[PDB]
């Protein structure tokens, strides 16, 4: 059937949708279709085509109050690693507290981890029951499942600037040095290539 209302969604609303590039963009919800127990959401992007998307592939174009965000919440967030900026999907890993200076830690679908603010987060409309299940990458998906379910039990390695460790990159281990520590993240300097990366302190990419 064709719907005009579906839960709190209404045809003609402005929303975010996931493009095939896996980045997220502003669009209009132009239709809502049901096929038995299934729902699909037609979005016309502002500078793009149309696509027919599952409800886990659209997000509200507002920032939610903090009490609607849990560890495991499915979100779209401003993705920034120094070399690129996008809106990209992820899972909330930490909510604001003293130890993270009142920020949200996001585990993005591609394995990147970053701290963002409340004003950089958007809630996905129709997340799956097990929110991580639409993470395409099996390694990333499984790590997030384990993390979210084990939380607040979080194995992490305690690291200090100057510390020498091995870090994984491209499937092998590299001589590296802790450059900076920020909450549950560490900035690792790969010594041979002289480049840095932010990595979660509980990542299995860290040899310890």
UniProtKB/Swiss-Prot annotation:
Which family is this sequence assigned to?
Belongs to the class V-like SAM-binding methyltransferase superfamily. Histone-lysine methyltransferase family. Suvar3-9 subfamily.
Cellular localisation: Nucleus; Cytoplasm; Chromosome
Miscellaneous comment as given in the Swiss-Prot or TrEMBL entry: Highly up-regulated in Huntington disease patients, suggesting that participates in the altered chromatin modulation and transcription dysfunction observed in Huntington disease. Its down-regulation has salubrious effects on patients, suggesting that it may be a promising treatment in Huntington disease patients.
- Provenance organism: Homo sapiens (Human)
Q: What is known of its domains?
A: The pre-SET, SET and post-SET domains are all required for methyltransferase activity. The 347-amino-acid insertion in the SET domain has no effect on the catalytic activity. Isoform 2 lacks all domains required for histone methyltransferase activity.
Gene name, per UniProt, is SETDB1
Provide the free-text tissue specificity comment from this protein's UniProt record.
Widely expressed. High expression in testis.
- Describe the protein's quaternary organization and the partners it interacts with: Part of a complex containing at least CDYL, REST, WIZ, SETDB1, EHMT1 and EHMT2. Forms a complex with ATRX, TRIM28 and ZNF274. Probably part of a corepressor complex containing ZNF304, TRIM28, SETDB1 and DNMT1. Interacts with TRIM28/TIF1B. Interacts with ATF7IP and ATF7IP2; the interaction with ATF7IP protects SETDB1 from proteasomal degradation and is required to stimulate histone methyltransferase activity and facilitate the conversion of dimethylated to trimethylated H3 'Lys-9'. Interacts with CBX1 and CBX5. Interacts with DNMT3A and DNMT3B. Interacts with SUMO2. Interacts with MPHOSPH8.
Q: Mind telling me what this protein is named?
A: Histone-lysine N-methyltransferase SETDB1
Task: Name the job this protein performs.
Answer: Histone methyltransferase that specifically trimethylates 'Lys-9' of histone H3. H3 'Lys-9' trimethylation represents a specific tag for epigenetic transcriptional repression by recruiting HP1 (CBX1, CBX3 and/or CBX5) proteins to methylated histones. Mainly functions in euchromatin regions, thereby playing a central role in the silencing of euchromatic genes. H3 'Lys-9' trimethylation is coordinated with DNA methylation. Required for HUSH-mediated heterochromatin formation and gene silencing.
Domain of life of the native organism: Eukaryota
Limits of the Tudor domain? 68-131, 158-208
Q: How is it modified after translation?
A: Degraded by the proteasome, shielded by interaction with ATF7IP.
């Amino acid at each position: 059937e064709n719907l005009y209302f579906q839960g709190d969604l209404i045809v003609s609303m402005r929303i975010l949708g996931k493009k095939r590039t896996k980045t997220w963009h502003k669009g209009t919800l132009i239709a809502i279709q049901t096929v038995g127990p299934g729902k699909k959401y037609k979005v016309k992007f502002d500078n793009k085509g149309k696509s027919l998307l599952s409800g886990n592939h659209i997000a509200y174009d507002y920032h939610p109050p903090a009490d609607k965000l849990y560890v495991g919440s499915r979100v779209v967030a401003k993705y920034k690693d120094g070399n690129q900026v996008w809106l990209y999907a992820g899972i909330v890993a930490e909510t604001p507290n003293v130890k993270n200076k009142l920020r949200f830690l996001i585990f993005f679908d591609d394995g990147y981890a970053s701290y963002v603010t409340q004003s950089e987060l958007y809630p996905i409309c129709r997340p799956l029951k097990k929110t991580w299940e639409d993470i395409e990458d099996i390694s990333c998906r499984d790590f997030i499942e384990e993390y979210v379910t084990a939380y607040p039990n979080r194995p992490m390695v305690l690291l200090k600037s100057g510390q020498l460790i091995k870090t994984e990159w491209e499937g092998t281990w590299w001589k590296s040095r802790v450059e900076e520590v920020d909450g549950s993240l560490v900035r690792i300097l790969f010594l041979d290539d002289k480049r840095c990366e932010w990595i979660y302190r509980g990542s299995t990419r860290l040899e310890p």
